[PDB]
Amino acid sequence: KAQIKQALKKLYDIDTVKINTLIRPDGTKKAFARLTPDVDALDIAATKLGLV
Amino acid sequence: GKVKAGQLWSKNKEELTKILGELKTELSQLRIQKISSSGAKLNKIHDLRKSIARVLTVINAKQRAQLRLFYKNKKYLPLDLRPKLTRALRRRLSKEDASRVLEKTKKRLTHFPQRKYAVKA
Amino acid sequence: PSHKTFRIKQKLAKAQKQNRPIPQWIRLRTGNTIRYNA
Amino acid sequence: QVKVVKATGANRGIKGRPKGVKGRYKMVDGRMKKEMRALKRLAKKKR
Amino acid sequence: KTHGLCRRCGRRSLHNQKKVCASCGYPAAKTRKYNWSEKAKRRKVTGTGRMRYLSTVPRRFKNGFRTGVPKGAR
Amino acid sequence: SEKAGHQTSAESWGTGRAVARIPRVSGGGTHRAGQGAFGNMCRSGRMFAPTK
Amino acid sequence: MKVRPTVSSSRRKARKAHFSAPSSVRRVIMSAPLSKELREKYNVRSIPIRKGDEVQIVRGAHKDKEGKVTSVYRLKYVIHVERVTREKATGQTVPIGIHPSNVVITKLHLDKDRENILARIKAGREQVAKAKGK
Amino acid sequence: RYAATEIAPTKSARARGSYLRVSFKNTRETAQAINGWKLQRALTFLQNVIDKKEAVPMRRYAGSTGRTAQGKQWGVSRARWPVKSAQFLIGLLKNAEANADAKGLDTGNLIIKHIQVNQAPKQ
RNA sequence: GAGACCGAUAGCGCACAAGUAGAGUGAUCGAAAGAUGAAAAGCACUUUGAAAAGAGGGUUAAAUAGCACGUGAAAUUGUUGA
RNA sequence: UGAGCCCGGGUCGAACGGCCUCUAGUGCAGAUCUUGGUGGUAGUAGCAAAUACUUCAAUGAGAACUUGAAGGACCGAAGUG
RNA sequence: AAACUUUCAACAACGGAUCUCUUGGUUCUGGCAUCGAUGAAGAACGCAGCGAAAUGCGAUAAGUAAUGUGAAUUGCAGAAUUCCGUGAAUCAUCGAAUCUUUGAACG
Ligand SMILES: [Zn+2]
Numbered sequence: 001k002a003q004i005k006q007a008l009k010k011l012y013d014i015d016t017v018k019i020n021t022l023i024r025p026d027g028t029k030k031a032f033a034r035l036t037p038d039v040d041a042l043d044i045a046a047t048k049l050g051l052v
Numbered sequence: 053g054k055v056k057a058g059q060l061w062s063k064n065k066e067e068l069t070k071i072l073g074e075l076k077t078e079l080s081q082l083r084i085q086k087i088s089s090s091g092a093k094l095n096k097i098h099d100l101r102k103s104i105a106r107v108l109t110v111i112n113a114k115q116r117a118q119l120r121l122f123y124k125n126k127k128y129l130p131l132d133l134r135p136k137l138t139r140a141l142r143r144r145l146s147k148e149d150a151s152r153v154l155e156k157t158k159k160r161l162t163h164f165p166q167r168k169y170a171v172k173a
Numbered sequence: 174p175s176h177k178t179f180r181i182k183q184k185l186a187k188a189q190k191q192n193r194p195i196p197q198w199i200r201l202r203t204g205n206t207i208r209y210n211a
Numbered sequence: 212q213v214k215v216v217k218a219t220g221a222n223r224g225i226k227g228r229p230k231g232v233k234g235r236y237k238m239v240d241g242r243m244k245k246e247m248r249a250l251k252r253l254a255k256k257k258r
Numbered sequence: 259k260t261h262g263l264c265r266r267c268g269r270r271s272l273h274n275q276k277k278v279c280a281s282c283g284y285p286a287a288k289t290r291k292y293n294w295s296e297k298a299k300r301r302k303v304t305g306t307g308r309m310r311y312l313s314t315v316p317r318r319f320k321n322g323f324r325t326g327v328p329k330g331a332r
Numbered sequence: 333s334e335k336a337g338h339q340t341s342a343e344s345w346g347t348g349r350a351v352a353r354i355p356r357v358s359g360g361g362t363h364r365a366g367q368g369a370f371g372n373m374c375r376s377g378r379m380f381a382p383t384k
Numbered sequence: 385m386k387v388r389p390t391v392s393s394s395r396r397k398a399r400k401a402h403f404s405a406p407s408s409v410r411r412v413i414m415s416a417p418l419s420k421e422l423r424e425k426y427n428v429r430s431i432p433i434r435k436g437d438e439v440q441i442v443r444g445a446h447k448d449k450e451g452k453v454t455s456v457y458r459l460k461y462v463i464h465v466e467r468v469t470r471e472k473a474t475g476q477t478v479p480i481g482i483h484p485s486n487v488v489i490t491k492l493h494l495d496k497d498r499e500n501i502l503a504r505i506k507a508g509r510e511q512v513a514k515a516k517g518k
Numbered sequence: 519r520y521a522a523t524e525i526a527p528t529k530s531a532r533a534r535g536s537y538l539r540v541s542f543k544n545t546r547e548t549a550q551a552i553n554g555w556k557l558q559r560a561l562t563f564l565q566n567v568i569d570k571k572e573a574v575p576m577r578r579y580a581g582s583t584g585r586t587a588q589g590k591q592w593g594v595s596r597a598r599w600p601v602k603s604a605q606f607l608i609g610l611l612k613n614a615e616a617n618a619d620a621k622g623l624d625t626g627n628l629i630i631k632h633i634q635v636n637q638a639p640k641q
Numbered sequence: 642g643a644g645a646c647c648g649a650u651a652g653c654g655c656a657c658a659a660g661u662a663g664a665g666u667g668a669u670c671g672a673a674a675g676a677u678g679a680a681a682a683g684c685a686c687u688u689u690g691a692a693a694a695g696a697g698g699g700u701u702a703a704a705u706a707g708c709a710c711g712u713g714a715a716a717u718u719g720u721u722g723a
Numbered sequence: 724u725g726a727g728c729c730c731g732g733g734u735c736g737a738a739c740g741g742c743c744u745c746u747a748g749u750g751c752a753g754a755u756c757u758u759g760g761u762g763g764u765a766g767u768a769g770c771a772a773a774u775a776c777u778u779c780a781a782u783g784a785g786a787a788c789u790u791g792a793a794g795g796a797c798c799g800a801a802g803u804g
Numbered sequence: 805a806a807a808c809u810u811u812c813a814a815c816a817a818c819g820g821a822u823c824u825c826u827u828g829g830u831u832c833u834g835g836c837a838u839c840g841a842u843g844a845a846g847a848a849c850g851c852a853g854c855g856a857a858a859u860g861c862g863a864u865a866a867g868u869a870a871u872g873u874g875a876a877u878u879g880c881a882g883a884a885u886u887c888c889g890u891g892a893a894u895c896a897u898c899g900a901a902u903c904u905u906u907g908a909a910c911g
């Protein structure tokens with residue numbers, strides 16, 4: 001979680017309130033990063049993540 | 053989006069590091085925007101991964117060349133820069149030690165060596 | 174059971190991946206004798 | 212003591228002990244019937 | 259069960275009471291090998307796996323285990 | 333090869349069974365289980381007078 | 385007759401080599417002959433085929449048909465020549481596979497590498513011709 | 519390919535089915551029952567067989583078949599109702615009738631010239 | 642590099658994703674399984690059918706070669722005729 | 724005489740034969756032979772106990788064992804939870 | 805008379821024998837001598853745009869560097885190559901590198 005937070009802050013300029021991680025059955029990790037109220041998840045996803 | 057080995061060889065350390073950082077940032081951006089509409093962007097990402105490998109290889113080779121120049125005239129060298137050969141080949145006697153001969157044998161060969169001769173028919 | 178290890182979980186994942194079927198483009202590849210997963 | 216089982220029906224072509232729960236068993240067939248006749252003829256010839 | 263996974267050979271042949279692999283003998287440094295089972299010897303003999311380095315040795319011998327780079331290389 | 337046909341573990345089932353008195357392969361989970369072996373008259377077995 | 389011990393007269397090994405050769409050996413195998421005018425122009429008999437060559441199919445169902453080589457398909461030892469095609473059931477057009485030993489090169493794709501190849505072949509041929517003549 | 523090669527294909531309509539999950543014996547008996555008839559009469563008879571109104575005689579494969587009065591239509595006492603075999607024969611007959619309509623023949627004057635049931639690889 | 646060898650029940654267990662699939666708690670045991678066609682040119686379009694498929698039509702020298710594919714015996718079975 | 728040899732018709736596609744010697748893993752009805760395949764028995768024996776299912780409607784090419792409603796039964800907190 | 809049982813023939817089934825073929829085996833012969841703490845043999849997990857296995861490779865991951873050849877790969881998709889060029893390739897050679905977890909296995 002510390003590395004995930006540091007990477008999100010350093011690269012994509014995302015501030016996160018918290019991070020919850022699990023390991024999927026296939027072997028990959030899934031991370032739910034809950035962001036600060038100041039930023040908007042929809043705006044960040046549309047701009048930096050390219051997700052509609 | 054392909055880098056050239058000759059250009060990387062010509063460039064020095066700082067430019068190689070800057071190029072590697074640029075390639076890695078581009079790789080992250082293209083992956084995030086590739087997860088949707090992975091296409092010719094997949095092609096670009098494949099070429100960019102190969103480029104990152106090329107830059108890393110060039111940096112490592114230049115650093116090893118500098119280290120070899122540093123250890124050119126030193127008695128001990130790192131195992132990485134030491135020759136590999138095989139275990140038995142590394143444990144064999146050196147050429148000088150294997151060709152070393154006793155002084156009495158050296159005198160005998162100096163004064164009574166194998167002579168050239170022919171015998172008629 | 175519910176209590177396991179990440180390594181055994183990864184082995185289970187590899188078990189499913191091996192128990193994935195065959196691709197049709199593999200079938201259509203030239204010189205191919207593969208028909209079904211054995 | 213020993214139970215004799217014919218190698219027929221469910222007992223034909225079995226690797227080992229049949230379903231008959233017994234301490235000691237012996238399987239029989241016509242081939243060993245002829246074996247036994249030859250052995251008995253040799254015994255009579257000896258006597 | 260009396261047999262779980264051995265780390266050295268990957269089979270379910272590790273006794274849990276004796277703590278010894280029935281196939282390779284994990285605790286012992288040597289790999290279990292007997293000459294009355296040529297089938298087992300050829301099942302786990304060299305060449306049945308990947309040969310990461312022993313495969314690269316012969317080409318180096320052919321070239322003479324030479325070190326360096328070709329003249330004029332960039 | 334001198335090992336042609338000798339590379340199996342077979343034993344005769346016995347005399348009391350209504351089957352041919354031929355060495356048969358042990359096992360139980362494949363076609364080769366229970367099949368004849370070590371015979372010049374048997375499939376995947378030896379041949380009479382192996383050539384030397 | 386074979387003399388040197390390096391050479392093999394074995395059908396099995398010959399066919400293994402032919403059918404498992406890599407791409408470069410496949411190119412050398414798929415070399416094709418030159419036209420007559422090109423022969424008296426270059427003193428070269430044959431040359432590996434490539435994509436820029438114009439050839440004339442002289443054997444097969446297509447008797448004497450010319451065209452520009454569109455694709456050389458080294459995996460199945462065939463080349464694709466322009467317009468020597470057949471329609472599938474659907475009407476979609478697919479090229480026919482014609483062998484380089486069956487095509488004859490009419491106009492050659494000139495570049496530095498192939499000029500060097502032709503120069504080397506000519507040098508060898510003229511040296512041996514001079515040696516045989518005198 | 520078809521066994522009966524002496525019939526011209528421009529005047530006849532043919533249907534075929536391979537690897538059908540039905541009983542070979544029952545299918546043979548019912549095909550022999552419907553052999554040589556008009557298409558409409560065969561269809562009506564097969565639907566009656568499904569509805570348990572008429573039954574096919576058990577002639578060759580007739581092990582321990584109970585008797586029924588309908589058997590007197592065939593001069594036999596042992597008759598049976600192979601519903602699934604009847605259904606598949608109806609399917610093939612409708613396919614053949616569609617083929618005859620496509621070729622333009624008169625469907626009212628068609629007879630079943632050839633019928634054959636062979637064994638398929640066993641499952 | 643070769644052979645008066647064997648030629649898919651033969652020859653190594655293995656001509657093939659074979660020490661594989663599978664069996665045994667385990668030491669271990671351990672198979673079966675090659676071939677369309679010169680070239681996929683692996684049947685467009687129409688019709689019946691829920692579909693699988695079928696019938697026209699078409700490719701090819703050949704579909705009496707349709708990916709249950711070279712040739713295709715006997716056992717056994719169906720139809721036809723005597 | 725015979726083991727056998729030869730020709731015709733159909734199928735099929737790529738190699739094969741006669742003669743004199745040489746050579747051998749060379750000739751089959753059996754071996755409760757080996758492997759593979761196929762029969763009669765035979766559409767035969769047989770497809771258990773847990774009391775028990777019924778009506779309408781919907782889906783569907785096709786409905787006893789797909790679903791919704793209603794009726795009749797059951798596990799009976801030491802359960803068919 | 806039909807049906808049924810049996811016989812003969814043609815076609816069609818079942819089945820995979822015979823003939824043909826062989827990137828396989830088997831035997832003989834010839835040149836050579838080369839595993840490993842600089843971490844071997846073996847096991848494990850990952851790596852392709854689309855891959856399950858075989859194969860290759862190791863987070864530089866069906867691969868990088870260098871040399872050579874000289875214009876491909878291919879099942880599809882997308883890119884190439886200006887071709888009068890340090891340069892395509894599931895290419896060859898191969899002297900530099902990368903080389904995850906165990907395994908003699910070593911906090
Ligand atoms: Zn072990």
